[PDB]
Amino acid sequence: TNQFDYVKIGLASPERIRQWGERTLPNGQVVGEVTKPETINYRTLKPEMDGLFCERIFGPAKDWECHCGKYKRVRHRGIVCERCGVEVTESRVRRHRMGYIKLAAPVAHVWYLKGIPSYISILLDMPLRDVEQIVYFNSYVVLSPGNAETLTYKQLLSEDQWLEIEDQIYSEDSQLQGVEVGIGAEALLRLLADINLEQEAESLREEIGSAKGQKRAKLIKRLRVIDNFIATGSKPEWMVMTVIPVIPPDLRPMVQLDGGRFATSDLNDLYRRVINRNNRLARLQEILAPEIIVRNEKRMLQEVDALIDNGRRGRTVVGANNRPLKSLSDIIEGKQGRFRQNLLGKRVDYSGRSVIVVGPKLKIHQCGLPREMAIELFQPFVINRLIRSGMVNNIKAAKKLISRNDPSVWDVLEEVIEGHPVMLNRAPTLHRLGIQAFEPILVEGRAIQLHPLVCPAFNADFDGDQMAVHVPLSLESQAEARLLMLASNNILSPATGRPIITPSQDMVLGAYYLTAENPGATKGAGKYFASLDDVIMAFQQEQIDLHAYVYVRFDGDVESDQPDTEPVKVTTNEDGSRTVLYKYRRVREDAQGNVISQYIYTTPGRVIYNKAIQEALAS
Amino acid sequence: AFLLPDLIEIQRSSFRWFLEEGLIEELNSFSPITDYTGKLELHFLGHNYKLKEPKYSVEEAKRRDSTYAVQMYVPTRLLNKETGDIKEQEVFIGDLPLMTDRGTFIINGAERVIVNQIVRSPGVYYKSEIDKNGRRTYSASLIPNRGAWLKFETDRNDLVWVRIDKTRKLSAQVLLKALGLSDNEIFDALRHPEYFQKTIEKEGQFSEEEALMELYRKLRPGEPPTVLGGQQLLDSRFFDPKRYDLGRVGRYKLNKKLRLSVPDTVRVLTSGDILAAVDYLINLEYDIGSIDDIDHLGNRRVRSVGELLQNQVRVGLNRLERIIRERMTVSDAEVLTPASLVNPKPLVAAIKEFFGSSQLSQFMDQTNPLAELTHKRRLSALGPGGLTRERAGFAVRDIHPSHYGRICPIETPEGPNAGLIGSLATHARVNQYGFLETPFRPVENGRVRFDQPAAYMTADEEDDLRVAPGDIPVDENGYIIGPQVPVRYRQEFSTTTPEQVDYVAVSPVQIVSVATSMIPFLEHDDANRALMGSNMQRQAVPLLKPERPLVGTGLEAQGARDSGMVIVSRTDGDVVYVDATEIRVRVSGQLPTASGKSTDNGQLTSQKGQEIRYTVSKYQRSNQDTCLNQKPLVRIGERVVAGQVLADGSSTEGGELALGQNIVVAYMPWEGYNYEDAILISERLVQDDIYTSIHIEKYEIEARQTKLGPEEITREIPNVGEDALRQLDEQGIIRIGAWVEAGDILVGKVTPKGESDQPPEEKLLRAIFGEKARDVRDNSLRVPNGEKGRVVDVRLFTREQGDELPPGANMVVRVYVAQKRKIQVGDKMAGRHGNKGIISRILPIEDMPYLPDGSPVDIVLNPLGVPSRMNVGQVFECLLGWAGHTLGVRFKITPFDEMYGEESSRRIVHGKLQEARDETGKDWVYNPDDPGKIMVYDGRTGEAFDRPVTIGVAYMLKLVHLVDDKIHARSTGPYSLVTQQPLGGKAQQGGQRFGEMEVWALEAFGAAYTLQELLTVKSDDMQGRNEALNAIVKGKAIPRPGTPESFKVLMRELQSLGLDIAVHKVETQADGSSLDV
Amino acid sequence: IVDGQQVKKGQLLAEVALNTEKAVKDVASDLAGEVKFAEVVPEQKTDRQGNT
Amino acid sequence: FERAKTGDIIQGLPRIEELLEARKPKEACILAKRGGEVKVVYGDGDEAIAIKVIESNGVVTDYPLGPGQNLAMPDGSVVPAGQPLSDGPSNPHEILEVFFSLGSEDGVYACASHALQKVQTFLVNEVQMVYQSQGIDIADKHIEVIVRQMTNKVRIDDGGDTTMLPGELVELRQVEQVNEAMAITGGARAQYTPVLLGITKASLNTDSFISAASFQETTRVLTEAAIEGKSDWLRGLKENVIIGRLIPAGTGYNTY
């Protein structure tokens, strides 16, 4: 909020990642690194020295306590374990500190490498496969001059097809160039930097002038691949790696189940690898023994690519079940891989999730909340109440009546439950009208309660149907629901012009039947009326069919089953009178007077089903 | 009618089968062993095997909640082709449990069961195979029951190559690697092998190719190609048993089709055959042989425990064989004894896998007796061996007229893992080649009567006799009217009359699986309709008081006996006192004895007043917390008869499937309270004392011994009511047979939690409020809220028996409870054919509509439901039942009106009506003008509803999805670790789960706020979330988001992955990099 | 609907019928015995596979 | 026998996505240059199964094939830039050009639209088709809006007449304003071709870094944005959603 603004992103860089990680300290000294594989010792339970879960360079465990010991209480704010690397605070700082494996060899990053695009292969025009042997060195590529004497650059060969090449060394000094042929992966890094992207970028732009076809595509890129870089200017040897980064320990953490089955993690073991492959190696260097155990390990060192992905490009390494040990680059990657689901779709708290059984008794604008989930549902605004008006006092001792189960909750809960908007959602979130809100009801049960009318929107039928009692939290989130998100705030799918909301086909039957007609029941001849409740009466009277059509008064516009403005039975006489049946209604008229009889010719039941309407909507 | 012999024990004898062959069979075959040198030998004896009585049983086994077993044993033969040192003695080999009474293997803990698999039983087949244009191709393929795949093909041009475990070489040295006899192909192929004479590009040189080309000439590269190289290679694909099979069958088949004489008792492979392929494919290339079937039994095939517990035992032992080969030949061998070089432990383990952990067990779901039918015998092709569950794309899923009579279509989980559950023909059986049976009953061109033979095969396939479906108007003694009957040739169903057929039903239902038969008259209900409904009863809940159905199709009674819940004599008797706890031809001392000696027997102790002892079961926690206690059924001194069920368990009275009860059902859209789907029922149900689950479920708890400084349970610690602490017992323990209700207290954990870094208030407050307590803690067990259950047992134990204990842990606390609990709202109750129901509300026994006879009814429905569900007959029963109920009428009659071959059903109904009402006296329960209706005088005040509406008796059956275990709602709590977000694994503190599909529908109106919160502070921000807590109880305007952090978390790993971000203000001096870390 | 015949009520109507690919008629005759070409012969003419 | 590859369980959930990303419906490619008429049955007098196409004004017919799975049969009334000659909305990119080519009397945009709108409007009706096909409904806000979005992106050539680049799949309206800047600051206004893309082509490309790795892309994507400094901004309702900045689309987004 405000403090942040906008996120740039570029190739990271050792020397730049050499700005964080290390944390010099007024021991006067210099702390960053790690070196040696580790979790805590078994017996004690805390990390070690280096140690992948360091209690020093990384920080605390028991909060404000130097590994050196002699450290209790807190208030200190600079402590540096006099004699240890414990610099306490809260045990929170620990989460905000990284280290690095410090690759002895300049390993390169898989994320350029076999990369679908393979940016690295592209630049220095090192064919993926070609450069794919610069690493896993099985063909060291002729590197820079290194061929004045007739051999050629960018050119490759395995040590086996090399020893004989540089064999003339015995005497022939055709070695004036005195530049060794490619040696291994580091070569790529040498050509990565030093090379002049400038004086070459435009050196391609004008090449573009020339024929531009299937080859152009490459060029083209190259331009971008270099221009995209010129944007910064930074190092392509940043794709190659000096030294790693490394995530903090508390988050990959080692886990607790007592008994000895202490799960630990699945990237610290990457490390576990990786650190060892790094140290043991160096620990060759010195003794400088044969490269068969050193240069061969450099591949077992570049093999750190697995750390970054068990899975691109070597066979994956195996897990407890030969699984692609979820790489550090396998945590926020799939829809089920943290990332969105761990942010765009967190699960979250405060709400209900109970079977939505049929319960059409209540109205629509409001839902019916059962008690099984009526307590959680507002405890914060409940505990505060009942104290707040002094009922009790304090927490965990005033909410005494909660778990005490008295009444006074239950009513007070209701007292603070009406006018408290709630929203709800079906197992499927479906559409926006799918998470509608409604005024929760104070009912008791393990099922929901809600208004049929909408189902369909949620479509929540009622056969083992299950949904969820969501709830606003801020106040004005109640607004999201107060007069913006609530069942009343919808009369037609934002989908179409259509008002999906409608009495179920069961009700439409109650409508249809009431508008039908039974041959048998056709009584009430001349049973006309002021068309008021008179016919209702006339129906609370029975002796009439709910479809026995009488002709009932009502000069107001009466939509008639059939055309009613047509000469059907004329009886135009004098002293007024022009008297046509108009089938479903029969005024007599008056030359001097006008129309008044009207005579809507339909069952009282009809007028009945067409009288509770005007009132229903707005009387 | 005819008797249908025991579903269940497919497995059993097949199971049995195994040991009454297998043990040896494999192991003896790799029988002999010896020092690498060869002198000091040792063998598996491969004969006169032995094992002793493992006194552990199943209940005593479940007693230590451990695995049943039989210590497993064998001797060697001897020591050496060095001087014939014997030093024979038995050597224990591999103990482990096995088949249990209720068709389980009571392993540790529990009694899972194994599911059969299909798979492409072996053989060598061959793609017809087609293209981008049309012009087509030919290709061949080979695979045994276990091993590589020999695969072949055609580059447009009567060419070949050979691909195996390589998929990298268009390599074809046919006959140029084995049997390179002078032009042996024009001796085995002879007909158009490569246009009769090879092609250009193919040369067939072998001098250095046989065992030396396509083996190193591109294969397996870099060394030189030693002729031996490929030699010992291609043994090493093949020749070499222990790395390849057919599978005795495999041959059976393989040969049999390609029919070539190779009987030859070899479960590995020859040359010639191969050729016979090779041709054969080209034979089909020249269109002389038909394309293989690759979809159903044609290539697919069951298998099952025997081999499941056989393939791996050879493997598990193969492992051993390596090791021993060292161990035996590790050093001196003079006296080192069979007994010495034998590490059984492997085998036992790995098998301990293969029950215990092979992804294959399930937990044998016993939610319902029936279930454990089905689950005897579904089967799949999920299998190590099986398919993906998403690369096994389609035909895989479909059906196949083989399925007709071989497996039921009404069986389908309709899930992403459905269409993979062989129903197992209601009658099938199988053979040593796994292939199942499905009878084809002969009709001598007009005359069946089942007097003819056969009628018992069509195993996995057919006969190319156009073939008689199940039923058709079968006249008295057979003569099989149908002028011109339709009947099935092969996957097809032409018409023809008594000439040319002869195989026909056993019975009119050879395509079902345990529950798809429940449907009393599926004859009248759509198939698309019949499925999940037929799978409802499949997993029905039980019900305290059982009741046969009403209405009758009756197939099942027996099946109930197959289940085991109901007990038949083992032998015989006429019961003495049949005490509920102890029925007895047990030590009776009486005539349950004597027929318990009817015509007595011997390994059965008739030796003395017979003696058939066995204890009934009370309410025990099923593997699914289901429960059932059977019932002492047969009263005393009342004769029995061998092997006839006399115990009334879960759901039979008497050997029938107690599912539901029988209920009047007027369908009726009344005042709503139901308008799909939506059940309504009358309070009576509760007062009826029926619809009463009961459940009982573990709770347990344990104590650690902290390396932090051990802790126990207590018998209390503070703030204990004895009001708490009372119905407690003498360690802290909780008294059994004691009522509990809600946040109740089990028993007294005592935990460690010192205060070294005394919290800021701490030392003082403690000493300040005025008292010096101590944090010896106690997370003792508090039973969940709403736990109004009397406690009902406990199993429990500590160091002393040797706690068989998860180590690091001190003493078991497991104990638990049930409760009688009547049905409520949202109960997924329904029927057994296209159903799924729940209920609003229940209701005053009076307001609900009643009858002119004067009784009130007890289940509305809606009425529209059924016509829509296109499931009609539910009527039927309604009806039929009606009867039943009016004149106590039983039916138990197979479905499908076949009598006369038309709507006789009808005929039935109105009939049994007719007389019933005729003799019902009132004669109102039926109206001539209401042929199937009734009247409905019973409005709100009991008017006359109007149209005479039909009602009657249905079989309402409830399910589990009880709101109780399916309830859920909570207000925050523990977040995760990693995201540190609370977490919903459907627990008491279960994440209100969450759906971004809604966060993709919650912005359609936007207004952030809810979102803003709606993420934040209930996800990332600590101090947010809390901030909240306060705000409200702090009369404060809950502020403003935190900022998320998980974000930051995601950012962290990224930054390490190689990211950078200046995230920052910019109104700041040249922006910068706001510390958002 | 779609064209119907008249031995009585007709032929398919309703899978709305306001697009025909090539593969074969079967011929397995329909009765066991010697089959010849009494009224016809088999013009080979080899238009699809340049053969027969 | 010719056999059913028709349908009337046809045009369903699958038969629309193939037009959404705008793949190669029918993968046809009939041309246009107006003549147009019955043209015997296949071009010039046809013959035994001979196959060509149609002509009236012109100096020429365009001449590809017609099969028996697949036909034209419109005789005359043939109209290019639309009414496909052999009749096939196929990888309409070709037809979109067919049009705009043939809409090359008008300065590129307006009758480009004339194509453009036509194609989208067509698609709209083509999608709304199955909609009413299938007894339902669909709106322009629900379709046009999206179908619109699906294109606004030209493909350049030549873009160097604007010191830009060729084959550049930027969008039209915007950057050719910049070509309109090179239409008012002199030099040259560049040429290019507005061409449809498809949601995963439009999206995935348009969205970058934060607006990436979360939909139809991930791993290399969003991370590769670092190869180029392409900063990102919480503008995207979801961009800030990944965070908790509130969104735009909420009072304040304008109340500011």
Curated annotation (Swiss-Prot), chain A:
GO terms for molecular function: DNA binding; DNA-directed RNA polymerase activity; magnesium ion binding; zinc ion binding. Its cofactor is Mg(2+); Zn(2+). Gene3D superfamilies: 1.10.40.90, 2.40.40.20, RNA polymerase II, clamp domain, RNA polymerase Rpb1, domain 3. Zn(2+) binds at C66, C68, C81, C84. Pfam families: RNA_pol_Rpb1_1, RNA_pol_Rpb1_2, RNA_pol_Rpb1_3. Keywords: DNA-directed RNA polymerase, Magnesium, Metal-binding, Nucleotidyltransferase, Transcription, Transferase, Zinc. GO terms for cellular component: DNA-directed RNA polymerase complex. Its EC number is 2.7.7.6. Binds 1 Mg(2+) ion per subunit. Binds 1 Zn(2+) ion per subunit. InterPro entries: DNA-dir_RpoC1_gamma, DNA-dir_RpoC_beta_prime, RNA_pol_asu, RNA_pol_N, RNA_pol_Rpb1_1, RNA_pol_Rpb1_3, RNA_pol_Rpb1_3_sf, RNA_pol_Rpb1_clamp_domain. One of its GO terms (biological process) is DNA-templated transcription. Mg(2+) binds at D461, D463, D465. It catalyses: RNA(n) + a ribonucleoside 5'-triphosphate = RNA(n+1) + diphosphate. Belongs to the RNA polymerase beta' chain family. RpoC1 subfamily. DNA-dependent RNA polymerase catalyzes the transcription of DNA into RNA using the four ribonucleoside triphosphates as substrates. In cyanobacteria the RNAP catalytic core is composed of 2 alpha, 1 beta, 1 beta', 1 gamma and 1 omega subunit. When a sigma factor is associated with the core the holoenzyme is formed, which can initiate transcription. This is DNA-directed RNA polymerase subunit gamma. It comes from Nostoc sp. (strain PCC 7120 / SAG 25.82 / UTEX 2576).
Curated annotation (Swiss-Prot), chain B:
Its EC number is 2.7.7.6. Disulfide bonds: none annotated. CDD domains: RNA_pol_B_RPB2. It catalyses: RNA(n) + a ribonucleoside 5'-triphosphate = RNA(n+1) + diphosphate. One of its GO terms (cellular component) is DNA-directed RNA polymerase complex. It holds the Pfam family RNA_pol_Rpb2_1. Belongs to the RNA polymerase beta chain family. DNA-dependent RNA polymerase catalyzes the transcription of DNA into RNA using the four ribonucleoside triphosphates as substrates. This is DNA-directed RNA polymerase subunit beta.
Curated annotation (Swiss-Prot), chain C:
This is DNA-directed RNA polymerase subunit beta'. Belongs to the RNA polymerase beta' chain family. RpoC2 subfamily. DNA-dependent RNA polymerase catalyzes the transcription of DNA into RNA using the four ribonucleoside triphosphates as substrates. In cyanobacteria the RNAP catalytic core is composed of 2 alpha, 1 beta, 1 beta', 1 gamma and 1 omega subunit. When a sigma factor is associated with the core the holoenzyme is formed, which can initiate transcription. It comes from Nostoc sp. (strain PCC 7120 / SAG 25.82 / UTEX 2576).
UniProtKB/Swiss-Prot annotation, chain D:
Coiled coil: none annotated. DNA-dependent RNA polymerase catalyzes the transcription of DNA into RNA using the four ribonucleoside triphosphates as substrates. In cyanobacteria the RNAP catalytic core is composed of 2 alpha, 1 beta, 1 beta', 1 gamma and 1 omega subunit. When a sigma factor is associated with the core the holoenzyme is formed, which can initiate transcription. Belongs to the RNA polymerase beta' chain family. RpoC2 subfamily. This is DNA-directed RNA polymerase subunit beta'. It comes from Nostoc sp. (strain PCC 7120 / SAG 25.82 / UTEX 2576). The gene is rpoC2. The chain holds residues 1004 to 1259 of 1355 of the full protein.
